[PDB]
Amino acid sequence: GPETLCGAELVDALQFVCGDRGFYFNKPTGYAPQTGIVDECCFRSCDLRRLEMYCAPLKP
């Protein structure tokens, strides 16, 4: 029951959702080796709200 996004598709999705903010791949940590969007969205399905957690912060 996929809806995994992997590779180019994942990036397309990130570009589309994040727009001009940009996006990143690894959840911050500190102070379980690095995991992030591939793990949550490619190896298993994630919804739009997970995905949107990987947009860079709004600056002003």
**What CATH number corresponds to the domain at position 28?**
1.10.100.10
Answer whether 49's CB lies under 8 Å from 43's CB. Answer: no
* Alpha helix ranges (H) inside the chain: 7-18, 37, 48-52
Resolution of the experimental model, in Å, one decimal = 2.3
What is the tally of structural domains in the chain? 1
CA distances from residue 49 to 32, 41, 45, 46, 55 in whole angstroms, order as listed: 23, 11, 12, 8, 11
The residues pairing with 23 across neighbouring beta strands, listed in sequence order, are 55
Is-cis flag, bond preceding 31, omega within 30? yes
Structural domain that includes position 5: 1-60
Residues 6-44: b if buried by 16+ CB within 10 A, e if exposed: eeeebeebbeeebeeeebbeeeeeeeeeeebbbebbbee
Query: From which experimental method does this structure derive?
Result: X-ray
3-state secondary structure of 26: strand
